[PDB]
Structures are given as C-alpha cells and as structure tokens.
Coordinates of all heavy atoms in Angstrom, one line a residue:
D1 N -2.2 -64.4 0.0 CA -2.4 -65.9 0.1 C -1.1 -66.7 0.1 O -0.2 -66.5 -0.5 CB -3.3 -66.4 -0.9 CG -3.8 -68.0 -0.6 OD1 -3.7 -68.3 0.6 OD2 -4.1 -68.6 -1.5
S2 N -1.1 -67.8 0.9 CA 0.1 -68.5 1.1 C -0.1 -69.9 1.2 O -1.0 -70.4 1.7 CB 1.1 -68.0 2.1 OG 2.2 -68.6 2.1
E3 N 1.0 -70.7 0.7 CA 1.1 -72.1 1.0 C 1.5 -72.6 2.4 O 1.0 -73.6 2.7 CB 2.2 -72.6 0.0 CG 1.8 -73.7 -0.9 CD 2.7 -75.0 -0.8 OE1 3.7 -74.9 -0.1 OE2 2.4 -75.9 -1.4
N4 N 2.2 -71.7 3.1 CA 2.4 -72.0 4.6 C 1.1 -72.4 5.4 O 0.2 -71.7 5.3 CB 2.9 -70.8 5.2 CG 4.0 -70.2 4.4 OD1 5.1 -70.7 4.5 ND2 3.8 -69.2 3.7
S5 N 1.4 -73.4 6.2 CA 0.5 -73.8 7.1 C 0.3 -72.6 8.0 O -0.9 -72.4 8.4 CB 1.1 -74.9 7.9 OG 2.2 -75.5 7.2
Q6 N 1.3 -72.0 8.4 CA 1.2 -70.8 9.2 C 1.2 -69.6 8.3 O 1.1 -69.8 7.1 CB 2.3 -70.7 10.2 CG 1.7 -70.7 11.6 CD 3.0 -70.8 12.6 OE1 4.1 -71.1 12.2 NE2 2.7 -70.5 13.9
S7 N 1.3 -68.5 8.8 CA 1.4 -67.3 8.0 C -0.1 -66.8 7.9 O -0.9 -67.5 7.5 CB 1.7 -67.6 6.5 OG 0.8 -67.0 5.7
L8 N -0.3 -65.6 8.5 CA -1.5 -65.1 8.8 C -2.3 -64.5 7.7 O -1.7 -63.7 7.0 CB -1.3 -64.2 10.0 CG -1.9 -62.8 10.2 CD1 -2.9 -63.0 11.1 CD2 -0.8 -61.9 10.7
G9 N -3.5 -65.0 7.5 CA -4.3 -64.5 6.5 C -4.6 -63.0 6.5 O -4.5 -62.4 5.5
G10 N -4.8 -62.4 7.6 CA -5.1 -61.1 7.9 C -5.4 -60.8 9.3 O -5.4 -61.7 10.1
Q11 N -5.6 -59.5 9.6 CA -6.0 -59.2 11.0 C -6.7 -57.8 11.1 O -6.3 -56.9 10.4 CB -4.8 -59.2 11.9 CG -4.9 -58.5 13.2 CD -3.6 -58.5 14.0 OE1 -2.8 -57.5 13.8 NE2 -3.3 -59.5 14.7
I12 N -7.8 -57.8 11.9 CA -8.4 -56.7 12.2 C -8.1 -56.2 13.7 O -8.1 -57.0 14.5 CB -10.0 -56.7 11.8 CG1 -10.7 -55.5 12.4 CG2 -10.6 -57.9 12.4 CD1 -12.2 -55.4 12.1
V13 N -7.7 -54.9 13.8 CA -7.6 -54.5 15.2 C -8.7 -53.5 15.5 O -9.0 -52.6 14.8 CB -6.2 -53.7 15.4 CG1 -6.1 -53.1 16.7 CG2 -5.1 -54.7 15.1
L14 N -9.3 -53.7 16.7 CA -10.2 -52.7 17.2 C -9.6 -51.8 18.3 O -9.2 -52.3 19.2 CB -11.4 -53.4 17.9 CG -12.2 -54.5 17.0 CD1 -13.4 -55.0 18.0 CD2 -12.6 -54.2 15.6
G15 N -9.7 -50.6 18.0 CA -9.1 -49.6 19.0 C -7.8 -49.0 18.5 O -7.3 -48.1 19.2
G16 N -7.2 -49.5 17.4 CA -5.9 -49.0 17.0 C -5.4 -49.7 15.8 O -6.2 -50.5 15.1
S17 N -4.1 -49.5 15.5 CA -3.4 -50.2 14.3 C -2.1 -50.9 14.8 O -1.7 -50.5 15.9 CB -3.1 -49.2 13.3 OG -4.2 -48.4 12.9
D18 N -1.7 -51.9 14.1 CA -0.6 -52.8 14.6 C 0.6 -52.5 13.8 O 0.8 -53.0 12.6 CB -1.1 -54.3 14.4 CG 0.0 -55.3 15.0 OD1 1.1 -54.9 15.4 OD2 -0.3 -56.5 14.8
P19 N 1.7 -51.9 14.5 CA 2.8 -51.5 13.7 C 3.7 -52.6 13.1 O 4.6 -52.5 12.4 CB 3.6 -50.5 14.5 CG 3.0 -50.5 15.8 CD 1.8 -51.4 15.8
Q20 N 3.2 -53.9 13.5 CA 4.0 -55.0 12.9 C 3.6 -55.2 11.5 O 4.3 -55.8 10.7 CB 3.7 -56.3 13.7 CG 4.5 -56.6 15.0 CD 3.8 -57.6 16.0 OE1 2.7 -57.9 16.0 NE2 4.7 -58.2 16.9
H21 N 2.5 -54.5 11.0 CA 2.0 -54.8 9.7 C 1.9 -53.6 8.8 O 1.3 -53.7 7.8 CB 0.7 -55.5 9.7 CG 0.8 -56.9 10.4 ND1 1.5 -58.0 9.8 CD2 0.2 -57.3 11.6 CE1 1.3 -58.9 10.5 NE2 0.6 -58.7 11.6
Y22 N 2.6 -52.5 9.2 CA 2.8 -51.4 8.3 C 4.1 -50.7 8.6 O 4.6 -50.9 9.7 CB 1.5 -50.5 8.4 CG 1.4 -49.7 9.7 CD1 2.1 -48.5 10.0 CD2 0.5 -50.2 10.7 CE1 2.0 -47.8 11.2 CE2 0.3 -49.4 11.9 CZ 1.1 -48.2 12.1 OH 0.9 -47.6 13.4
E23 N 4.7 -50.0 7.6 CA 5.9 -49.3 7.9 C 5.6 -47.7 7.7 O 4.5 -47.4 7.1 CB 7.1 -49.8 7.0 CG 7.1 -49.8 5.5 CD 8.0 -50.8 4.8 OE1 7.8 -52.1 5.2 OE2 8.7 -50.6 3.9
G24 N 6.4 -46.9 8.4 CA 6.3 -45.5 8.3 C 5.1 -45.0 9.1 O 4.6 -45.7 10.0
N25 N 4.6 -43.8 8.7 CA 3.4 -43.3 9.3 C 2.2 -43.2 8.3 O 2.4 -43.3 7.1 CB 3.6 -41.9 10.0 CG 4.9 -41.8 10.7 OD1 5.8 -41.1 10.4 ND2 4.8 -42.5 11.9
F26 N 1.0 -43.2 8.9 CA -0.1 -43.0 8.2 C -0.3 -41.7 7.5 O 0.1 -40.7 8.2 CB -1.4 -43.2 9.2 CG -1.7 -44.6 9.5 CD1 -1.6 -45.0 10.9 CD2 -2.1 -45.5 8.5 CE1 -1.9 -46.3 11.2 CE2 -2.4 -46.7 8.9 CZ -2.2 -47.2 10.1
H27 N -0.8 -41.7 6.2 CA -1.2 -40.6 5.5 C -2.7 -40.6 5.6 O -3.4 -41.5 5.2 CB -0.7 -40.7 4.1 CG -1.4 -39.8 3.1 ND1 -1.8 -38.5 3.4 CD2 -1.7 -39.9 1.8 CE1 -2.3 -37.9 2.3 NE2 -2.3 -38.8 1.4
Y28 N -3.3 -39.6 6.2 CA -4.7 -39.5 6.6 C -5.4 -38.7 5.6 O -4.9 -37.7 5.1 CB -4.9 -38.9 8.0 CG -4.6 -39.8 9.1 CD1 -3.4 -39.7 9.8 CD2 -5.4 -41.0 9.3 CE1 -3.0 -40.5 10.8 CE2 -5.0 -41.9 10.4 CZ -3.9 -41.6 11.1 OH -3.5 -42.6 12.1
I29 N -6.6 -39.2 5.2 CA -7.4 -38.5 4.2 C -8.7 -38.4 4.8 O -9.3 -39.3 5.5 CB -7.5 -39.3 2.9 CG1 -6.1 -39.6 2.5 CG2 -8.2 -38.4 1.8 CD1 -6.0 -40.3 1.1
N30 N -9.5 -37.2 4.6 CA -10.6 -37.0 5.3 C -11.8 -37.5 4.7 O -11.9 -37.5 3.4 CB -10.9 -35.4 5.6 CG -10.0 -34.9 6.7 OD1 -9.5 -33.8 6.6 ND2 -9.8 -35.7 7.8
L31 N -12.8 -38.1 5.3 CA -14.1 -38.5 4.6 C -14.7 -37.4 3.9 O -14.5 -36.3 4.4 CB -15.1 -39.2 5.5 CG -14.6 -40.4 6.4 CD1 -15.8 -41.0 7.1 CD2 -14.0 -41.4 5.4
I32 N -15.4 -37.7 2.8 CA -16.2 -36.6 2.3 C -17.3 -36.1 3.3 O -17.5 -34.9 3.5 CB -16.9 -37.0 0.9 CG1 -15.9 -37.2 -0.1 CG2 -17.9 -35.9 0.5 CD1 -16.2 -38.1 -1.1
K33 N -18.0 -37.1 3.8 CA -18.9 -36.9 4.9 C -19.0 -38.1 5.8 O -18.7 -39.2 5.3 CB -20.3 -36.6 4.3 CG -20.7 -37.8 3.2 CD -22.2 -37.5 2.7 CE -22.7 -38.7 1.8 NZ -21.9 -38.8 0.5
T34 N -19.3 -37.9 7.1 CA -19.7 -39.0 7.9 C -20.8 -39.9 7.3 O -21.7 -39.4 6.5 CB -19.8 -38.4 9.3 OG1 -19.9 -39.5 10.2 CG2 -21.1 -37.6 9.6
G35 N -20.9 -41.2 7.6 CA -22.1 -41.9 7.0 C -21.5 -43.0 6.0 O -22.2 -43.8 5.6
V36 N -20.3 -42.8 5.5 CA -19.8 -43.7 4.5 C -18.3 -43.7 4.4 O -17.7 -42.6 4.4 CB -20.3 -43.1 3.0 CG1 -20.1 -44.2 2.1 CG2 -21.8 -42.8 3.0
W37 N -17.7 -44.8 4.4 CA -16.3 -44.8 4.3 C -15.8 -44.5 2.9 O -15.4 -45.4 2.2 CB -15.8 -46.2 4.8 CG -15.9 -46.4 6.3 CD1 -16.6 -47.4 6.9 CD2 -15.3 -45.7 7.4 NE1 -16.6 -47.3 8.3 CE2 -15.6 -46.3 8.5 CE3 -14.4 -44.6 7.5 CZ2 -15.2 -45.9 9.8 CZ3 -14.0 -44.1 8.8 CH2 -14.4 -44.8 9.9
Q38 N -15.9 -43.2 2.5 CA -15.7 -42.7 1.1 C -14.9 -41.5 1.1 O -15.2 -40.5 1.8 CB -17.1 -42.6 0.4 CG -16.9 -42.4 -1.1 CD -18.2 -42.4 -1.8 OE1 -18.4 -43.0 -2.8 NE2 -19.1 -41.7 -1.2
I39 N -13.9 -41.4 0.2 CA -13.0 -40.2 0.2 C -12.9 -39.8 -1.3 O -13.3 -40.5 -2.1 CB -11.6 -40.4 0.6 CG1 -11.0 -41.7 -0.2 CG2 -11.5 -40.7 2.1 CD1 -9.5 -42.1 0.2
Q40 N -12.4 -38.5 -1.6 CA -12.2 -38.1 -2.8 C -11.0 -38.7 -3.6 O -10.0 -39.0 -2.9 CB -12.1 -36.5 -3.0 CG -13.6 -36.1 -3.0 CD -13.9 -34.5 -3.3 OE1 -13.6 -33.7 -2.6 NE2 -14.2 -34.3 -4.6

C-alpha cells in the first residue's frame, strides 16, 4: 500500500508473468495433486 496517487496496487497476468515485477528466475514447486493450488 501506498500514499501515491499513482503506484500500482497490483497486477494479474493471464498467459504469463511480468518480469518488471520480479527479479531472477522462478523456483517451481509441484502441486501435491491437481485440483487445489496446494504444495508441501
């Protein structure tokens, strides 16, 4: 959260991710099972 009039609250990308908002590469972890966005 910010006091700025501007300054973006957040963003969802469909189809991909936006390297303006993360550094480095993704560390991927596998779902336990399909059906639920849940990992160990």
Side-chain angles (χ1 to χ4, degrees):
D1 192 25
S2 184
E3 232 240 353
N4 310 280
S5 339
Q6 240 171 347
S7 137
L8 133 101
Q11 167 183 88
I12 169 176
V13 177
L14 311 183
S17 307
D18 180 1
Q20 280 160 336
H21 297 289
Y22 66 83
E23 62 211 53
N25 314 108
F26 284 117
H27 165 35
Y28 282 106
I29 311 184
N30 284 141
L31 300 185
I32 292 151
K33 51 178 187 292
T34 191
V36 193
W37 292 118
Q38 194 171 222
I39 55 183
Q40 276 190 286

